[PDB]
Design a protein around this motif. Structure first.
Motif, short mmCIF file in Angstrom:
data_model
loop_
_atom_site.label_atom_id
_atom_site.label_comp_id
_atom_site.label_asym_id
_atom_site.label_seq_id
_atom_site.Cartn_x
_atom_site.Cartn_y
_atom_site.Cartn_z
N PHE A 27 8.38 9.57 -7.66
CA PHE A 27 9.05 9.76 -8.45
C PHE A 27 8.46 9.32 -9.77
CE2 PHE A 27 11.16 8.10 -4.72
CZ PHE A 27 12.92 9.20 -4.43
N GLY A 28 7.72 8.74 -9.81
CA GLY A 28 6.91 8.22 -11.20
C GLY A 28 8.03 7.83 -12.24
N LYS A 29 7.68 6.87 -12.09
CA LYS A 29 8.97 6.76 -14.01
C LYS A 29 8.48 4.74 -14.24
CE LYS A 29 10.69 6.00 -9.56
NZ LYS A 29 11.80 6.12 -8.68
N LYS A 30 8.32 5.08 -15.34
CA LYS A 30 8.59 3.12 -16.29
C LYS A 30 8.92 2.74 -17.44
CE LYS A 30 5.81 6.40 -17.05
NZ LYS A 30 5.66 7.82 -17.06
N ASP A 31 9.69 4.20 -17.86
CA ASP A 31 10.82 3.92 -18.90
C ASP A 31 11.61 3.35 -18.60
OD1 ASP A 31 8.86 5.55 -20.53
OD2 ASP A 31 9.67 4.07 -22.03
N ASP A 32 12.88 4.49 -18.02
CA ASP A 32 14.29 4.03 -16.96
C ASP A 32 14.12 3.41 -15.31
OD1 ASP A 32 16.40 3.85 -16.76
OD2 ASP A 32 17.17 6.07 -16.16
N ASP A 33 13.06 3.08 -15.61
CA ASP A 33 12.43 2.59 -14.36
C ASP A 33 13.64 2.42 -13.49
OD1 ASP A 33 10.05 1.76 -12.71
OD2 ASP A 33 11.33 0.61 -12.05
N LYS A 75 0.68 -1.28 0.18
CA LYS A 75 0.35 -0.40 -0.24
C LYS A 75 1.41 1.70 0.03
CE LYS A 75 -4.09 -0.66 1.02
NZ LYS A 75 -5.11 -1.63 -0.02
N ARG A 76 1.80 1.13 0.64
CA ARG A 76 2.27 2.68 0.51
C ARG A 76 3.83 2.08 -0.42
NH1 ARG A 76 6.41 4.76 5.68
NH2 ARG A 76 6.49 2.37 6.05
N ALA A 77 4.42 0.89 -0.99
CA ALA A 77 5.25 1.18 -2.28
C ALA A 77 4.53 1.88 -3.47
CB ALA A 77 5.38 -0.32 -2.68
N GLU A 78 3.45 1.89 -3.28
CA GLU A 78 2.61 2.72 -4.33
C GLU A 78 2.48 3.74 -3.38
OE1 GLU A 78 -0.78 0.34 -4.39
OE2 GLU A 78 -0.96 0.89 -6.31
N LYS A 79 3.16 4.80 -2.79
CA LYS A 79 3.56 6.04 -2.27
C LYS A 79 4.99 6.86 -2.52
CE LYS A 79 -0.79 5.96 -1.17
NZ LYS A 79 -0.51 7.03 -2.12
N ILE A 80 5.83 5.59 -2.49
CA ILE A 80 6.89 6.67 -2.14
C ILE A 80 7.33 6.13 -4.38
CG2 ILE A 80 9.43 5.87 -1.77
CD1 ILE A 80 8.53 4.05 0.42
N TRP A 81 7.57 5.28 -4.37
CA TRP A 81 7.68 4.55 -5.97
C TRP A 81 7.14 5.35 -6.91
CZ3 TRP A 81 11.49 2.64 -7.57
CH2 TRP A 81 11.89 2.38 -8.34
N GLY A 82 5.70 5.08 -6.33
CA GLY A 82 4.64 6.63 -7.68
C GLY A 82 5.10 7.86 -7.28
#
Length: 188
Positions: free
Chosen positions: A158-164, A149-156
């Motif tokens: 920065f926001g990254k999908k290409d150079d993830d 539930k939180r991993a989405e807050k931290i990783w979300g």
């Protein structure tokens, strides 16, 4: 060597939510004699766990610290420095030395390759939370009580999908700007 300097360990660790009935002077005699008995201070998991469970019982030796000790490296078991390790355990809630930002990327990169990925981040999150006791991990508000539930807050954030893949370079910038990150990123 200096018992007084040992106090900085109890006080610092105390903040990390880890008390130790062992006085500072005691740890000093044990710390120096632990490193003397062993080669410089190279210990193995079988040994770390003991010290971990002997110093911090209520803390699930499979929660925070465990994840930290396993992050230093410990590839095929082998052994790792205890001193440098201890620092990694304290260099997460203190605030004495200046450098401390790009230093986190170390435990943040479990594998250790200058690149942070979902998995890695998922570990850290779980570790910290894992330490928290269940009957207690419920008090905190919901919709934010699961490691995912939180991993989405931290990783979300920065926001990254290409150079993830976050590098040790941006890891310092993506944080130098957004100040709201220092609020949750707090890895206790």
């Amino acid at each position: 060597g200096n018992s007084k300097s040992g106090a900085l360990s109890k006080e610092i660790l105390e903040e990390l939510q880890l008390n130790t009935k062992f006085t500072e002077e005691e740890l000093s005699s044990w710390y120096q004699s632990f490193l003397k008995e062993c080669p410089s201070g190279r210990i193995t998991r079988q040994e770390f766990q003991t010290i971990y469970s002997k110093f911090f019982p209520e803390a699930d030796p499979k929660a925070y610290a465990q994840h930290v000790f396993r992050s230093f490296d410990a590839n095929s078991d082998g052994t790792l420095d205890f001193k440098q390790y201890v620092i990694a355990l304290h260099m997460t809630s203190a605030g004495k030395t200046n450098q401390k930002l790009e230093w986190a990327f170390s435990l943040y990169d479990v594998d250790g390759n200058g690149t942070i990925s979902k998995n890695e981040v998922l570990e850290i999150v779980t570790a910290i939370f894992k330490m928290i006791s269940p009957e207690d991990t419920k008090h905190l508000p919901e919709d934010e009580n699961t490691p995912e539930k939180r991993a989405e807050k931290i990783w979300g954030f920065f926001g990254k999908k290409d150079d993830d893949k976050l590098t040790e370079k941006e890891f310092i910038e993506g944080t130098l700007a957004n100040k709201e990150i220092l609020r949750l990123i707090q890895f206790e």
